[PDB]
Design an enzyme around this catalytic site. Sequence first.
Site, mmCIF file in Angstrom:
data_model
loop_
_atom_site.group_PDB
_atom_site.id
_atom_site.type_symbol
_atom_site.label_atom_id
_atom_site.label_comp_id
_atom_site.label_asym_id
_atom_site.label_seq_id
_atom_site.Cartn_x
_atom_site.Cartn_y
_atom_site.Cartn_z
ATOM 1 N N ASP A 25 -18.074 -50.513 48.122
ATOM 2 C CA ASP A 25 -17.251 -49.488 47.530
ATOM 3 C C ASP A 25 -16.221 -50.247 46.653
ATOM 4 O O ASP A 25 -16.110 -51.467 46.737
ATOM 5 C CB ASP A 25 -16.626 -48.612 48.625
ATOM 6 C CG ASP A 25 -15.723 -47.492 48.071
ATOM 7 O OD1 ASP A 25 -16.048 -46.944 47.002
ATOM 8 O OD2 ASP A 25 -14.727 -47.132 48.739
ATOM 9 N N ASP A 27 -12.630 -48.825 45.231
ATOM 10 C CA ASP A 27 -11.262 -48.521 45.561
ATOM 11 C C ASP A 27 -11.049 -48.868 47.072
ATOM 12 O O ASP A 27 -11.878 -48.570 47.913
ATOM 13 C CB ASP A 27 -10.978 -47.038 45.220
ATOM 14 C CG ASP A 27 -11.208 -46.693 43.682
ATOM 15 O OD1 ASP A 27 -10.614 -47.352 42.796
ATOM 16 O OD2 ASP A 27 -12.013 -45.783 43.349
HETATM 17 MG MG LIG Z 1 -12.598 -46.581 49.049
#
Ligand SMILES: [Mg+2]
EC number: 3.1.3.16
Lengths: 291, 291
Positions: A25, A27
């Site tokens: 992922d 962020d």
């Molecule tokens: Mg995230």
Amino acid sequence: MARCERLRGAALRDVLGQAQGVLFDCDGVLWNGERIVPGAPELLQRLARAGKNTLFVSNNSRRARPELALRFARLGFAGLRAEQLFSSALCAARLLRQRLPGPPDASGAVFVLGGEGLRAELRAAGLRLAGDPGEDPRVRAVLVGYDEQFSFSRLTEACAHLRDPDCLLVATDRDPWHPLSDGSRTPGTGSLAAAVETASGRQALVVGKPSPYMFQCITEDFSVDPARTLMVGDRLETDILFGHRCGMTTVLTLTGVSSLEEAQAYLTAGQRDLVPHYYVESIADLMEGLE
Amino acid sequence: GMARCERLRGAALRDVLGQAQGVLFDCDGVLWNGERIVPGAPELLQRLARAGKNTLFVSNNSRRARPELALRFARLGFAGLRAEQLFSSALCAARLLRQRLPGPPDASGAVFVLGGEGLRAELRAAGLRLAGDPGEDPRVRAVLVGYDEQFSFSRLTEACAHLRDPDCLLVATDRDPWHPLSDGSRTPGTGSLAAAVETASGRQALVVGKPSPYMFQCITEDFSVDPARTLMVGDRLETDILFGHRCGMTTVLTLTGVSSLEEAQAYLTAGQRDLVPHYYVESIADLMEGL
Ligand SMILES: [Mg+2]
Ligand SMILES: [Mg+2]
């Protein structure tokens, strides 16, 4: 059955070696706002150098693939191919193209609750959008994404298109909210979708994590062996749960949304699909198992 | 067990009304549709009163404060109503908030309201201070979600910020998902807005309006109502009829509004008994033959 143990020492070395690839992922994992997680670019480099495939799987529906690629480079991550980038925006474009191909030349348009990035992604796949120049076709789907222009009048318009039972309802994801650097939060696509679903009486098809559709999107382009793949994420209810549903090994990193105590909570409650196999303080810790 | 969705007419209509001490009416879809009254509705109320039967009015419409609702009755031809008989979700939300916010005496805070002027006026009549009114703005101590044609992503964000404080209450006037307009289209209802706020904040709202029993509590603080001798008359199965069942009243579906006879018979065949009305009528005018 995941025990949420701290990945270090020899186990860290074994787990990575067995790996064909790592899914990251973005962020909460590679960066927080404009601050990168220290070590992350170096980590990515050493991964590629060791022949391990890296893909990036994000629920962020704000950025089209070209602008995502630029963010990576600008933030110090060099050598990324665009093919490696999977956002909910991108996979929603592809899902919609496939559900709308139909034999009929009479393709319609998608009414989009979202920003330029999401719109751009749909146009890139060849979809026409309600509200672009020229005639407007029949609206044949409503797409709910992260929509800072969300408004009562736009909810109302979305619901009108949805009175036609053949008009599809798609959401990029159901993340309920997201942290901002200043400590506050912004509502997520999931809150907007709940409004749209409630006002229209419909259930959305959800594209992003933890929906498996995202993995489908990824496997159209790459061969992925989930048993030899690491899913690395900061959010238990999206990244980890996704990883379990796809049969991947799951790593919670602690630089983002969820805490170890949230994980250990789930473990004690036996909800095992939300318990990571492993955790690290940050993805930087993973490098000790490399050279 | 009981509800069988029988047509209330003949001797059954005469018996049911004779046993009754009072009738509770929903407003929209029952006494009127938009600016068109249901033919016979004014006469019915009059005749009910002449027969010594008590009448109260219970509405989820969070738009008109009680003074203007009373003027509406009068203007549309319903004579002899006192305003004390009108129970809207706006009113009952104001009272709930007034109950729950008397506390640190003088250190009352303010209510952040997602909704219109009507709802605002109702809260001010109850003595509540509102964020966004003149002057400072005390600490926000409650978020109220009502029907908010000015609903926007930034205001949802503001609601969520107040709700980070676990001590700030979340109230919703109702969960109706959408409402019919005269032109055949629909407007999103409070339930859709509430679902957005609940999802983005991670909270559960206290719901004031039907089918919440809180609405019945609000009514019985002012009048003695024996549920076993009271009819609940409404056009919406999932709000009015469920309400009536939860409060232990006899339930009458009228067909001049949202729900249909077949929708009800479907619920019956499916064993969802809390959504099956005891009786139905084509319009509340039919009730008159029984007086
Ligand atoms: Mg995230
Ligand atoms: Mg009604």
